[PDB]
């Protein structure tokens, strides 16, 4: 009962995307809440379980499916389910813990990971950084693939964790940051996989702090700058949300917005 | 030669006062140069003379008109003709009294004032300040009178400043700020003369600080904060730019825009 956004690979073009990309963000913020033309992710504070989570459900041209769970409260995915398995990211708390058992409610094999679902964990469990990972369309279709036959045997933790890493950029971060969906946009015209550059990157480092930053700033302006990477590694300094704008799609809640206080 | 833009106070209404500031606006600055959404003035260095001034010819219920000479470098009103004489004030420099020397060419009596058309000194020779001279259409269609009689000895010193006090915040101050344009509106709306408050006061005494720090700043935001008066006196804090999106509407050019530099 959760929202299904569906997504499939097989034939998949700049529009496809940017629809389902667009209908995640849809699903995971509802307009209440807005800083600087930016929008807020529901705060975890109070929310009820029956609006905690979206479903995304990935399909293959290999006829493959698997369905991820993202949390509203900060579009993480938790968990997935293929077939008759679901698995989820070991929780960081007791009441996170309890949220998951409403997921995938009749799926007959349920298991948590001892192991979290954040990229320095997946990284070690991969044996690759992010940035010696391709993302594209291509590494999606085979990532859809990797977690089907997880529950078969047919897919080593080192390509389980790679797969999750390229799921998590290019949904979760192309959510939250409209330059990453951009990227991943000319990833699929072209069909040319590749690795994401440092731009890519630093901001989803920095996607927490980018959030608090914009939420705590004096009408807009940083009380201390954010150093961001371009893509040739070079720095790019942050002081002010307006630079952002074009760049992060949604944040996580971080405080309450101060009074207007118009002149 | 020089655009003419005409007003009067007799039966004046909310929209014949907006139409008369927007097009003021329109005829100060070009549209080539915003910086956050702001419009700037043309830059001074290198203005040809053919761009240098507007005109704005300025009647009442009387049946008197007068025609008010600005800069569209600072919206400064810098002298005026009734019939056949017309008063500048003291120029700053050289070049500034070269530039008068094109206006009302062919008016028979010229006169420099030794003073100038700042607020400091007006309010030094109308004998009050500011705070304690009265806007709105009833003024102006008395400085409007004040200003037409004064070649025939019609009119005293103090009352001339004081009209030269009431045109120019009516005129130039609403053109700066659609802030001080809504406060003249709000006066014409109920047709109710009345002397502006700390947050109009201090607006016009920080017009040049305001644009050059939203020149200078980062991205928006301001290295050191501006303070402001709201109507009670109290203090605003200006941070960044964003606040005075809805405040000002057009800036003093100070600094070129450094490059786009978006990410």
Same mark, same amino acid.
């Given at each position: 009962?959760?929202?299904?956004?569906?997504?499939?690979?097989?034939?998949?073009?700049?529009?496809?995307?940017?629809?389902?990309?667009?209908?995640?963000?849809?699903?995971?913020?509802?307009?209440?809440?807005?800083?600087?033309?930016?929008?807020?992710?529901?705060?975890?504070?109070?929310?009820?379980?029956?609006?905690?989570?979206?479903?995304?459900?990935?399909?293959?041209?290999?006829?493959?499916?698997?369905?991820?769970?993202?949390?509203?409260?900060?579009?993480?995915?938790?968990?997935?389910?293929?077939?008759?398995?679901?698995?989820?990211?070991?929780?960081?708390?007791?009441?996170?813990?309890?949220?998951?058992?409403?997921?995938?409610?009749?799926?007959?094999?349920?298991?948590?990971? #001892?192991?979290?679902?954040?990229?320095?964990? +997946? !990284?070690?469990?991969? $044996?690759? *950084?992010?940035?010696? =990972?391709?993302?594209? %369309?291509?590494?999606?279709?085979?990532?859809?693939?990797?977690?089907?036959?997880?529950?078969?045997?047919?897919?080593?933790?080192?390509?389980?964790?790679?797969?999750?890493?390229?799921?998590?950029?290019?949904?979760?971060?192309?959510?939250?940051?409209?330059?990453?969906?951009?990227?991943?946009?000319?990833?699929?015209?072209?069909?040319?996989?590749? #690795?994401?550059?440092?731009?890519?990157?630093? +901001? !989803?480092?920095?996607? $927490?702090? *980018?959030?608090?930053? =914009?939420?705590?700033? %004096?009408?807009?302006?940083?009380?201390?700058?954010?150093?961001?990477?371009?893509?040739?590694?070079?720095?790019?300094?942050?002081?002010?949300?307006?630079?952002?704008?074009?760049?992060?799609?949604?944040?996580?809640?971080?405080?309450?917005?101060?009074?207007?206080?118009?002149?």
């Amino acid at each position: 009962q959760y929202p299904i956004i569906n997504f499939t690979t097989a034939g998949a073009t700049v529009q496809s995307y940017t629809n389902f990309i667009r209908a995640v963000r849809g699903r995971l913020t509802t307009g209440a809440d807005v800083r600087h033309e930016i929008p807020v992710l529901p705060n975890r504070v109070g929310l009820p379980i029956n609006q905690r989570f979206i479903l995304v459900e990935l399909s293959n041209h290999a006829e493959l499916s698997v369905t991820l769970a993202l949390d509203v409260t900060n579009a993480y995915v938790v968990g997935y389910r293929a077939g008759n398995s679901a698995y989820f990211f070991h929780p960081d708390n007791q009441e996170d813990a309890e949220a998951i058992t409403h997921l995938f409610t009749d799926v007959q094999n349920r298991y948590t990971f #001892a192991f979290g679902g954040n990229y320095d964990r +997946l !990284e070690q469990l991969a $044996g690759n *950084l992010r940035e010696n =990972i391709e993302l594209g %369309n291509g590494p999606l279709e085979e990532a859809i693939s990797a977690l089907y036959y997880y529950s078969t045997g047919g897919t080593q933790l080192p390509t389980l964790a790679r797969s999750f890493i390229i799921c998590i950029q290019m949904i979760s971060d192309a959510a939250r940051f409209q330059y990453i969906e951009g990227e991943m946009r000319t990833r699929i015209r072209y069909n040319r996989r590749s #690795a994401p550059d440092p731009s890519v990157i630093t +901001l !989803e480092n920095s996607w $927490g702090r *980018l959030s608090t930053a =914009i939420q705590e700033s %004096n009408q807009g302006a940083f009380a201390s700058p954010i150093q961001l990477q371009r893509r040739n590694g070079s720095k790019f300094s942050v002081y002010d949300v307006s630079i952002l704008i074009p760049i992060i799609a949604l944040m996580v809640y971080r405080c309450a917005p101060p009074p207007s206080s118009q002149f």
